[PDB]
């Protein structure tokens, strides 16, 4: 309301908990926006990425995150 | 050796943040009889098990001129016998029958360790300390007394030899009385210790001067909450809307910066971060630093601070002669506590006869070279290593080397050479 | 070949990419670090694209001089 | 030959003066450049002189090389 | 009940997101969420950032003793 610019970081913030705090050789599943981000800044591996050159593991994923907990 | 005893000894024990600082007031006196010689120097001892985390050792006699009565220490080795030992030069020979009084100040690392080893968010954390209800020394002692003084009253468990006193955040101990030499009894005590627990398992300290009027020094920090391990989830949620959650949490510390300090920055490897608040006070810039996220015990993070400063607050010449001053290290908190410090000085390119005066013992390398923009020749480097730091080490250092008058001047007619080739390279096309 | 990505499957990295901007970013890199004007890479990636979007005047003023005058 | 008894140096250019300068020597160097080049693509084989060239563009190159100095001092990108 | 839902709304529904709104008002669908309390089975909460911007989970390790999570 001062007309100062507010900043959310909570993307990098993220990102580098898990490059610190978390196992080197953990899985990150994620959907395939952000396989870049997490690739390039949190260095984990990942299940899908933005190249979606296997449309059959995006599937599989989104599979994962629409069905139910069980 | 000549024949001294340790009169009296009133030992002081401070336990109140993940460092344990001793304090001894020890009256020195002399037992023999004028046939034996005028005693020069005494001896110090460390319990083996504490002398591989010995950070700091300093002494001084009782005295106003704290910066002139400092003693002169030489760690020694006495023949056929286990511990590290330490000889003191006295100022004034002892003779039979004199005495004098002298403070032991001793500071150890690590020796507080979290049990139990793993909480939750919402669990307090106890630590316990393992010392010695004596003063370990290679003389008898007539009579002491030891003061122990805790980080909370809300004491655990505690040895309870010779009917100790308790009293709120403090425990009182002895007299004992005609305490052979290298006597010892393991004290131990358990009690709750909320402090930061913070540890820079690795800083690297950069200096690199120009006779541009500027020096500039980058500090990246590796920095460990060494505290009693996270067990389980971190809610958040909990952690926003209780005080109570997380009291062993370390959210911010705050870095006592140069007063000169121009163009502070702080970033990490992956960007800027945008929280750190910055106060210029006249005697020093006061930043507070606040890490991307909160450490909870077993977490680590990763930052690079550094800032210019201007040359005449710490350069100081005598025509071809320079010699950079320093003040040994940055002070990031009170009671900061670093595993290993790498310390390079990075003179200009050119300086000759570099000599240094170590204000005490750190392991130094082979000088590198490095090489940056506008470079041929390269910088020669100063390399140190040392180990297991401590805020009483941000003593002064100073570094001489020879320079001269031309070599700034030849870094622009190395600059022009590529331009003016540049232009020869159209003509001949 | 990258194994850090697309876990099991992993992912042909040379054998399924354009290599010509990388390959321009490091035979800039080289030259300048060649004079020990040590940028660091990230700066040329990041500049990359101002400096080839001031030649494309250049060769748009020349294209368009061969179409029509200067 | 011990702390206190001694000297300390500083540039004598000092902090102010670098804006000035690198705007005066690179403001040069650009003009005798665009001589140069005027010159350059106008004269021909009958017409050019060596020893015009050589001066002009040894001139652009001093100024040139010491307005860059100057403003990448005022960056602060400290050589 | 997919998980999804159940992954970005988990202790959600109790956070008075806006002054003239009830708890568990969501800033950008407009609506009090339907299911408020629940409990996760198969993961535990990691760390969820100052903003609860990104939330990242972990996938609770199969039960020690051969009991069914239900």
């Given at each position: 309301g001062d007309g100062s610019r507010i900043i959310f970081d909570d993307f990098r913030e993220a990102y580098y908990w898990l490059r610190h705090n978390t196992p080197e050789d953990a899985k990150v599943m994620s959907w395939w926006d952000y396989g870049y981000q997490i690739t390039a800044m949190a260095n984990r591996t990942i299940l899908v990425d933005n190249n979606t050159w296997n449309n059959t593991h995006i599937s599989r994923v989104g599979q994962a995150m629409a069905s139910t907990e069980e | 050796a000549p024949p001294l005893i340790n009169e009296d000894v009133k030992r002081t024990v401070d336990l109140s943040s993940h460092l344990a600082k001793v304090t001894a007031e020890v009256v020195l006196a002399h037992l023999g009889g004028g046939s034996t010689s005028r005693a020069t120097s005494f001896?110090?001892?460390?319990?083996?098990?504490?002398?591989?985390?010995?950070?700091?050792?300093?002494?001084?006699?009782?005295?106003?001129?704290?910066?002139?009565?400092?003693?002169?220490?030489?760690?020694?080795?006495?023949?056929?016998?286990?511990?590290?030992?330490?000889?003191?030069?006295?100022?004034?020979?002892?003779?039979?029958?004199?005495?004098?009084?002298?403070?032991?100040?001793?500071?150890?690392?690590?020796?507080?360790?979290?049990?139990?080893?793993?909480?939750?968010?919402?669990?307090?954390?106890?630590?316990?300390?393992?010392?010695?209800?004596?003063?370990?020394?290679?003389?008898?002692?007539?009579?002491?007394?030891?003061?122990?003084?805790?980080?909370?009253?809300?004491?655990?468990?505690?040895?309870?030899?010779?009917?100790?006193?308790?009293?709120?955040?403090?425990?009182?101990?002895?007299?004992?009385?005609?305490?052979?030499?290298?006597?010892?009894?393991?004290?131990?005590?358990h009690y709750e210790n909320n402090s930061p627990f913070l540890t820079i398992t690795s800083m690297t300290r950069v200096i690199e001067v120009s006779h541009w009027g500027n020096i500039a020094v980058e500090e990246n920090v590796d920095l460990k909450h060494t505290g009693a391990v996270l067990k389980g989830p971190f809610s958040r949620y909990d952690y926003q809307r209780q005080p109570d959650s997380g009291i062993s949490s370390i959210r911010s510390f705050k870095t006592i910066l140069p007063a000169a300090a121009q163009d502070v920055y702080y970033r990490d490897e992956i960007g800027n971060v945008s929280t750190s608040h910055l106060l210029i006070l006249d005697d020093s810039v006061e930043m507070?630093?606040?890490?991307?996220?909160?450490?909870?015990?077993?977490?680590?993070?990763?930052?690079?601070?550094?800032?210019?400063?201007?040359?005449?607050?710490?350069?100081?010449?005598?025509?071809?002669?320079?010699?950079?001053?320093?003040?040994?290290?940055?002070?990031?908190?009170?009671?900061?506590?670093?595993?290993?410090?790498?310390?390079?000085?990075?003179?200009?390119?050119?300086?000759?006869?570099?000599?240094?005066?170590?204000?005490?013992?750190?392991?130094?390398?082979?000088?590198?070279?490095?090489?940056?923009?506008?470079?041929?020749?390269?910088?020669?480097?100063?390399?140190?290593?040392?180990?297991?730091?401590?805020?009483?080490?941000?003593?002064?250092?100073?570094?001489?080397?020879?320079?001269?008058?031309?070599?700034?001047?030849?870094?622009?007619?190395?600059?022009?050479?590529?331009?003016?080739?540049?232009?020869?390279?159209?003509?001949?096309? | 070949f990258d194994d850090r990505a697309w876990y099991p499957l992993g992912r042909i990295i040379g054998g399924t990419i354009y290599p010509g901007l990388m390959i321009t970013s490091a035979a800039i890199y080289h030259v300048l670090h060649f004079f020990h004007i040590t940028i660091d890479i990230r700066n040329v990636c990041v500049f990359l694209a101002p400096l080839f979007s001031s030649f494309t005047t250049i060769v748009t003023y020349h294209l368009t001089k061969e179409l029509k005058d200067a | 030959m011990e702390l206190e008894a001694m000297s300390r140096y500083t540039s004598p250019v000092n902090p102010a003066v670098f804006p000035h300068l690198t705007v005066v020597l690179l403001a040069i160097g650009m003009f005798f450049t665009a001589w140069f080049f005027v010159y350059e693509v106008t004269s021909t084989k009958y017409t050019r002189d060596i020893y015009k060239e050589l001066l002009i563009s040894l001139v652009a190159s001093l100024f040139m090389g010491f307005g860059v100095l100057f403003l990448l001092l005022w960056v602060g990108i400290y050589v | 009940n997919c998980l999804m839902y159940k992954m970005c709304y988990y202790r959600f529904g109790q956070v008075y997101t806006e002054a003239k709104r009830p708890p568990g008002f969501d800033r950008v669908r407009n609506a009090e969420i339907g299911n408020k309390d629940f409990e996760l089975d198969v993961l535990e909460e990691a760390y969820t950032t100052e903003h609860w911007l990104v939330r990242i989970y972990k996938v609770k390790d199969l039960d020690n003793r051969g009991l069914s999570r239900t």
């Open positions: - | 001896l110090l001892a460390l319990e083996p098990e504490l002398e591989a985390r010995l950070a700091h050792l300093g002494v001084q006699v009782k005295g106003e001129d704290e910066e002139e009565n400092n003693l002169e220490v030489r760690e020694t080795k006495i023949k056929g016998k286990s511990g590290r030992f330490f000889t003191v030069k006295l100022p004034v020979a002892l003779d039979p029958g004199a005495k004098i009084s002298v403070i032991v100040e001793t500071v150890y690392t690590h020796v507080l360790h979290p049990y139990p080893t793993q909480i939750t968010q919402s669990e307090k954390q106890f630590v316990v300390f393992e010392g010695n209800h004596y003063f370990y020394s290679p003389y008898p002692t007539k009579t002491q007394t030891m003061r122990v003084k805790l980080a909370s009253r809300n004491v655990e468990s505690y040895t309870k030899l010779g009917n100790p006193t308790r009293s709120e955040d403090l425990l009182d101990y002895g007299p004992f009385r005609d305490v052979p030499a290298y006597s010892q009894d393991t004290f131990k005590v507070e630093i606040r890490p991307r996220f909160p450490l909870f015990g077993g977490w680590k993070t990763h930052y690079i601070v550094g800032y210019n400063l201007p040359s005449y607050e710490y350069l100081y010449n005598l025509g071809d002669q320079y010699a950079l001053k320093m003040r040994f290290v940055d002070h990031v908190f009170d009671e900061q506590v670093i595993d290993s410090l790498t310390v390079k000085i990075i003179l200009p390119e050119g300086a000759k006869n570099i000599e240094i005066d170590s204000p005490y013992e750190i392991s130094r390398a082979p000088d590198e070279l490095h090489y940056t923009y506008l470079d041929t020749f390269g910088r020669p480097v100063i390399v140190a290593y040392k180990k297991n730091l401590v805020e009483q080490h941000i003593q002064d250092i100073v570094v001489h080397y020879t320079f001269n008058k031309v070599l700034m001047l030849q870094e622009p007619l190395l600059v022009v050479a590529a331009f003016y080739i540049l232009f020869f390279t159209v003509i001949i096309y | - | - | -």
